[PDB]
């Protein structure tokens, strides 16, 4: 049901498997209930997990989708993580 995503600094992120499967890389890595990201920091992986919940909630909606916020400070690193994760 849930999966553990561990960042470079040991922060464990428990997320629904359906949500983590948004990332094609994670989807592949999950075929284990834990995935270690030796490259992604916590401030980055937390915003990725937020993207997963945002994506699952807003995909095929018909309402009004809000902008996904990204702080300037995280923008570069999040780009590298998103590029790695096929997100």
């Amino acid at each position: 049901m849930y999966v553990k995503l561990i960042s470079s600094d040991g922060h464990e992120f428990i997320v629904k498997r359906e949500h983590a499967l948004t990332s094609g890389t994670i989807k592949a890595m999950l075929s284990t209930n834990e995935v270690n990201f030796r490259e992604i920091p916590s401030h980055v992986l937390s915003k990725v997990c937020m993207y997963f919940t945002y994506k699952v909630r807003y995909t095929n909606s018909s309402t009004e989708i809000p902008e996904f916020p990204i702080a300037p400070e995280i923008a570069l690193e999040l780009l590298m993580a998103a590029n790695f994760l096929d997100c």
Binding site: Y54, I65, F68, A75, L76, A82, N83, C87
Partner: protein, 134 residues
């Protein structure tokens, strides 16, 4: 090739920008050429005079980011609800970076060659209109 039908049949449309972006409406003329129209501020509506069978698309007026209209890419006249798509986290990140860095300076950011080429490959209407031949 992906053009407007010259119906000559008036159709009243209401463009509703249900997005945080400034929308640029783009009409594809009888020759398939994209014709830009006056921009819609963030939460604004506009009663426009169009025609049945005419083709429309909506993009971000500044960055040219793609937008949806009634959950799809193209609009054929009536309510035209312009919304943000759920962009990928990669596209969203590229958008933010592009909005903070001058095109010339993209080569100065400490990232992989692929990402430099991803930033350089700006959203374009002509490029989109070509992807819509498949």
């Amino acid at each position: 090739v992906l053009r407007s039908v010259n119906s000559r049949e008036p159709s009243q449309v209401i463009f509703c920008n249900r997005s945080p972006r400034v929308v640029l409406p783009v009409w594809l003329n009888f020759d398939g050429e994209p014709q830009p129209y006056p921009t819609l501020p963030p939460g604004t509506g506009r009663r426009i005079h169009s025609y049945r069978g005419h083709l429309w698309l909506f993009r971000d007026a500044g960055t040219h980011d793609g937008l949806l209209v009634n959950q799809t890419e193209l609009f054929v006249p009536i309510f035209a609800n312009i919304t943000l798509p759920v962009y990928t986290l990669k596209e969203r990140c590229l958008q933010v970076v592009r909005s903070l860095v001058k095109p010339e300076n993209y080569r100065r950011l400490d990232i992989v060659r692929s990402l430099y080429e991803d930033l350089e490959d700006h959203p374009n209407v002509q490029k989109d209109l070509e992807r819509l031949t498949q």
